Symmetry: D3
Subunit: 175 residues, 6 copies
Amino acid sequence: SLLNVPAGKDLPEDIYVVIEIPANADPIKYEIDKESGALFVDRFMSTAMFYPCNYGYINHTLSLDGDPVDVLVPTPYPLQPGSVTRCRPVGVLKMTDEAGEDAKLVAVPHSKLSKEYDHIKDVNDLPELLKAQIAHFFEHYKDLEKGKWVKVEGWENAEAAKAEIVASFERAKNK
Amino acid sequence: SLLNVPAGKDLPEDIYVVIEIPANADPIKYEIDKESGALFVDRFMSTAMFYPCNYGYINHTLSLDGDPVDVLVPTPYPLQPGSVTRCRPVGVLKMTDEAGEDAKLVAVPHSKLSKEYDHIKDVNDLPELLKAQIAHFFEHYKDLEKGKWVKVEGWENAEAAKAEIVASFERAKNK
Amino acid sequence: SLLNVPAGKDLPEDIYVVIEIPANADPIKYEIDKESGALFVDRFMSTAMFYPCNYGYINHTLSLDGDPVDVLVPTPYPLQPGSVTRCRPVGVLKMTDEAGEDAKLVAVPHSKLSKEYDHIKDVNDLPELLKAQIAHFFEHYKDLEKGKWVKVEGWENAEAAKAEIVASFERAKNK
Amino acid sequence: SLLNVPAGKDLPEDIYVVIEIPANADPIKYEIDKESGALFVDRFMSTAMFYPCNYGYINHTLSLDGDPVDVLVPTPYPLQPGSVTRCRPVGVLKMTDEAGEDAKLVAVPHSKLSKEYDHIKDVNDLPELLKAQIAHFFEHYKDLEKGKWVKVEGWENAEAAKAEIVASFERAKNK
Amino acid sequence: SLLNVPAGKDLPEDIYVVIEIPANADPIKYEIDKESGALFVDRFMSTAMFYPCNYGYINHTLSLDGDPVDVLVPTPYPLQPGSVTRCRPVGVLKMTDEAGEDAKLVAVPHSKLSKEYDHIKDVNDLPELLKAQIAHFFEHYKDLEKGKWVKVEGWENAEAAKAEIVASFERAKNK
Amino acid sequence: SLLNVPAGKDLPEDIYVVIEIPANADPIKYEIDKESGALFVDRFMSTAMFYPCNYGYINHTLSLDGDPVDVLVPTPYPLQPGSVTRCRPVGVLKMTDEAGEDAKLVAVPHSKLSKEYDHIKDVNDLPELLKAQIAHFFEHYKDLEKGKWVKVEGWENAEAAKAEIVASFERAKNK
Ligand SMILES: [Cl-]
Ligand SMILES: [Cl-]
Ligand SMILES: [Cl-]
Ligand SMILES: [Cl-]
Ligand SMILES: [Cl-]
Ligand SMILES: [Cl-]
Ligand SMILES: [Cl-]
Ligand SMILES: [Cl-]
Ligand SMILES: [Cl-]
Ligand SMILES: [Cl-]
Ligand SMILES: [Cl-]
Ligand SMILES: [Cl-]
Ligand SMILES: [Cl-]
Ligand SMILES: [Cl-]
Ligand SMILES: [Cl-]
Ligand SMILES: [Cl-]
Ligand SMILES: [Cl-]
Ligand SMILES: [Cl-]
Ligand SMILES: [Mn+2]
Ligand SMILES: [Mn+2]
Ligand SMILES: [Mn+2]
Ligand SMILES: [Mn+2]
Ligand SMILES: [Mn+2]
Ligand SMILES: [Mn+2]
Ligand SMILES: [Mn+2]
Ligand SMILES: [Mn+2]
Ligand SMILES: [Mn+2]
Ligand SMILES: [Mn+2]
Ligand SMILES: [Mn+2]
Ligand SMILES: [Mn+2]
Ligand SMILES: [Mn+2]
Ligand SMILES: [Mn+2]
Ligand SMILES: [Mn+2]
Ligand SMILES: [Mn+2]
Ligand SMILES: [Mn+2]
Ligand SMILES: [Mn+2]
Ligand SMILES: [Mn+2]
Ligand SMILES: [Mn+2]
Ligand SMILES: [Mn+2]
Ligand SMILES: [Mn+2]
Ligand SMILES: [Mn+2]
Ligand SMILES: [Mn+2]
Ligand SMILES: [Mn+2]
Ligand SMILES: [Mn+2]
Ligand SMILES: [Mn+2]
Ligand code: NA
Ligand code: NA
Ligand code: NA
Ligand code: NA
Ligand code: NA
Ligand code: NA
Ligand code: NA
Ligand code: NA
Ligand code: NA
Ligand code: NA
Ligand code: NA
Ligand code: NA
């Protein structure tokens, strides 16, 4: 099942991302259930917003919000919920929400899957519009959900993203 | 796997529905295989009709047709086949088909997933058009499939829906 | 052409709405060109937001922003850009943007097209979630477009919507 | 505009069909307005049914229902509302509805557009399932619209379809 | 999981096909992972081409390319990735790629799922256009992927397809 | 109508492109009819290929193939057939087909519509993958259409694209 997918072939540079929400999809917030490995509806989002990239997590990790670390994966075409993509981290949006510190990694499809994103080496190679759109999404998508909120801290580089991946892998290993 | 999903957090008021067919989808009748938990094609429907709501079942139940009890789930956006949604029963369309008594529960997304359907407390709060469309669908969707047929009995309330859920849970428990 | 469509069969209660942007569509802001009647791309929106209803205008009207008065039309299924729907006004979101006062009418499909929205007689019959989502959209969709902005004033009733329709028809008549 | 499209290059064998409703689309019944040439919503259909083929009309014709003669066009991929396709008639479903005699021609894409349908020479070359699905659609799609109804008479051949095209062209010519 | 699905109810005439890629989908080459049973992205295809039919494999088989034998399944509507369809083989496109001999079976939905394809008894009953399109796809879809290539050998009949199914089942059984 | 749209606000740097075929669409080759301004189906393409960008033309121009000069427009989301987008030329794929010399301009959305493509100043700023995909499409999409063919000459810069625009505008002006 999806429960058994590795964190990656060679963390933190070579990871697998389990996709929960496709890019430019309807505002249904799916989450994989850790007991069954099935995709559950967590929420029907209240704002008229969509995830700007495919969205999911790295298996066998844990953020301080109590769930595996979150990842945004840009692709040329939207991915299937429940599918897995091999990726390379390139940056991170540091942020906190009501459940705890809750960074959003950005990881691009691995070179073996496409050459498309090879030119994206670090956070400044991501389009500025995309980074602005991602930060705006996380700042506002909970605006009509009472008691849910976000504080965006800022964009950091690939090295910061890789440190976040290591920390989150250790957290899962360790409790 | 989907085979392991509970019937619900607190049956019969708080249930989980495994989705097989999205709302306003192509006429492919998928069914979860009980041995493997995979989605199989049961039929390519012959009529030019679509399921009026997302369609699926409550795990760990059994109707007299030999399959888990059936559920229609209205949502603002179609659900993914194989996904699970927490719901609250609000009514039932009693009917029989060639395989046996085969009620169609209507359950709305639980308040925790959205406030959208909180105002739907009982069957008379469902839109009349929707209930008419559901009954018409089940009356006609087998019209071009020889030896398959339906007899619709009528709409009943939330309390009837909850009794159906209990009965179907017991049937699975019991044989 | 679309240039020749009446404002309505019986303004202000019975109107036609020319659709520019479908509900739950990609963020491409189309506008009908008044010289040619063709649909032009005005903008690729920068935020990850979508119009919560079909969006367009009443022909042969003018708002203070210099364009025909704007309308949101809820429907069960998204409409085609460039299509026309007969509608009945039920409420208005008063607001201003960088181009001038720029109210957003809400008009539902006319009874002749469907009975679905007959129960929506006035603004308080619109779902609260929908009204919240519409106001949030207009408050934020220009957040990443420099020099574009909105000030939302508030929701008003059907009678206010009808007065806005009359005023906007007169403005076009008159200059 | 669409108002100016010929009935065909060489009626009745070589026709143009103006498309109003795509195949396997949402149940929005669009109709071209004869004054403006714009696509108007005639109805949001009440049944959970979809047109089994692209649906539209031959310009410069008239059926006894007061509108141009109706055509179903099978294609490998759905057509755009408001687009025009060159076709060849292969059969007709004779029927009446509340507005008058109202045959449904079946015309396939002309050989110049594709070789796909060349093998369809006459009505018996259409798939039986498709013909059954079309007849079932027209028998039932008005089932929840009070005062709207259909009586299906039966399938007839290409020669009957061509006679219907001639008759309908003459009717428009003549009153 | 999908790992546990039989090759078929009665190989080689009555098989199950696990679907990885829907018909007329975006060019994302998904493959089921044999360890986890999850759908992984193998590649984002570089050419502007799409699989002409649903595409997948027969479980518990092995081709000389090291993966389960490949199958194309025509259907009236695209299938879900990860779903299973009961099918009947009707022909095979013999070909080799960089990974080894790599035939492409064509199998149609079993009569129990639909009567639509009953008339397809053998390879010459498949539309010529479809067979041409399939061969052209496999000849060209790797044209922009360095070191990936195909040599198409030619179309063969149902009996050849069934022999391929038997051989591939034995290969898996046997090493 | 679309017949009346200018070639551009300031040719050759500031153009309007009438869209006939959306990006990543079904293989239906639409063309605007010069007499009526309606979208006609020219062909159902025989290969399993899709246009890699939105595709259309500059009004009031003529290529040697007898039709207005062709344009590919990359966008973040596919455009509507029959819509118009303001664009800036950045490069050209020189090629010939059976109808004559038939260059394919590449023009990006104008800065006024989005800042997304501002960084694309000339042909070498287009992604290499995209340019490879476009050339491969035009080399192969007619492979199964007898008597239709293409010879691709090669990619040239923005200045070459602008000269092509001027030449094609003059050709229309002049005969
Ligand atoms: Cl791991
Ligand atoms: Cl979050
Ligand atoms: Cl930012
Ligand atoms: Cl349980
Ligand atoms: Cl049933
Ligand atoms: Cl009813
Ligand atoms: Cl008027
Ligand atoms: Cl606005
Ligand atoms: Cl509000
Ligand atoms: Cl004519
Ligand atoms: Cl009718
Ligand atoms: Cl029939
Ligand atoms: Cl087996
Ligand atoms: Cl292959
Ligand atoms: Cl072939
Ligand atoms: Cl001009
Ligand atoms: Cl060409
Ligand atoms: Cl190239
Ligand atoms: Mn969307
Ligand atoms: Mn969560
Ligand atoms: Mn998460
Ligand atoms: Mn969070
Ligand atoms: Mn999180
Ligand atoms: Mn069943
Ligand atoms: Mn069931
Ligand atoms: Mn049943
Ligand atoms: Mn049942
Ligand atoms: Mn404007
Ligand atoms: Mn407007
Ligand atoms: Mn405005
Ligand atoms: Mn306005
Ligand atoms: Mn549909
Ligand atoms: Mn009519
Ligand atoms: Mn008609
Ligand atoms: Mn009629
Ligand atoms: Mn008619
Ligand atoms: Mn496609
Ligand atoms: Mn492979
Ligand atoms: Mn394979
Ligand atoms: Mn291969
Ligand atoms: Mn293979
Ligand atoms: Mn042409
Ligand atoms: Mn052209
Ligand atoms: Mn050409
Ligand atoms: Mn050309
Ligand atoms: Na979407
Ligand atoms: Na909140
Ligand atoms: Na649908
Ligand atoms: Na039947
Ligand atoms: Na959408
Ligand atoms: Na702004
Ligand atoms: Na559809
Ligand atoms: Na009726
Ligand atoms: Na597609
Ligand atoms: Na290659
Ligand atoms: Na597509
Ligand atoms: Na050719």
